[PDB]
């Protein structure tokens, strides 16, 4: 659920 | 019964072949493409509302108007005292480059450029002047005259 | 598609 969303948004904001 | 299973999986791959992930990424591809589409290259010209003094003495140079593709430049005519000066008539050189409209009583002509930077010239016979006002229109400059308040050298019917 | 719906 939200764990995947949080990991994904962190991976998005870390990789430009 | 598993034939139902793989048949159903296959059809959900065909009738709705765009996965929910795929619908959204196609969405995003759409706005990136059409944003780079709509994005004007370079900086756009600065929108300015200016004011020029129109001198009609021999040797004086005609006042200039910066315009742009599809934007309205509103030319309002005032005498020396800054009061409105209605238009008797007007004459546009090469209206294939320029579309001016004007409610037939007022003292404003509103002008759109139709091809990007090719420049032209305009005559405007005002009410009290034997001398027509001649104005050079250049589109595609680094500024766009949203308005200009041109102060003609003479005195109008409004004092 | 989450399990906390």
């Amino acid at each position: 659920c939200t764990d995947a969303a949080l990991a994904a948004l962190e991976y998005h904001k870390s990789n430009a | 019964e598993v034939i139902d299973k793989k048949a159903f999986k296959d059809m959900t791959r065909n009738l709705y072949p765009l996965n929910p992930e795929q619908v959204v990424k196609l969405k995003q591809i759409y706005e990136t493409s059409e944003y780079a589409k709509a994005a004007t290259p370079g900086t756009p010209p600065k929108p300015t509302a200016t004011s020029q003094f129109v001198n009609l003495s021999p040797g004086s140079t005609p006042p200039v108007i910066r315009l742009s593709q599809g934007f309205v430049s509103s030319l309002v005519f005032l005498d020396s005292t800054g009061a409105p000066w209605p238009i008797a008539a007007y004459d546009l050189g090469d209206p294939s480059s320029f579309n001016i409209q004007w409610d037939k009583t007022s003292n404003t002509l509103m002008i759109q450029a139709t091809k990007l930077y090719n420049y032209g010239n305009l005559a405007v016979r005002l009410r009290g002047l034997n001398t027509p006002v001649m104005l050079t229109l250049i589109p595609g400059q680094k500024a766009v005259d949203y308005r200009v308040d041109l102060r003609v050298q003479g005195y109008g019917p409004n004092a | 598609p989450f399990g906390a719906d």
């Binding site: - | 209605p86 238009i87 008797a88 008539a89 007007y90 004459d91 546009l92 050189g93 090469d94 209206p95 294939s96 480059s97 004007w102 037939k104 009583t105 | -």
Partner: protein, 48 residues
């Protein structure tokens, strides 16, 4: 032998690219000059 012949075909090839670009230029240049000879008559509106 085979190398010789396809080298010769390549050598013969490098003469028609200029003429096809030339034809494309006819399509472009005439269209420009037609744009350019167009003059559109000045329009006059008489006030009320």
């Amino acid at each position: 032998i085979l190398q010789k012949q396809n080298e010769q075909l390549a050598e013969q090839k490098y003469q028609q690219e200029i003429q096809q670009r030339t034809s494309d230029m006819l399509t472009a240049a005439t269209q420009l000059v037609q744009d350019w000879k167009q003059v559109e008559t000045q329009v006059y509106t008489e006030g009320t």
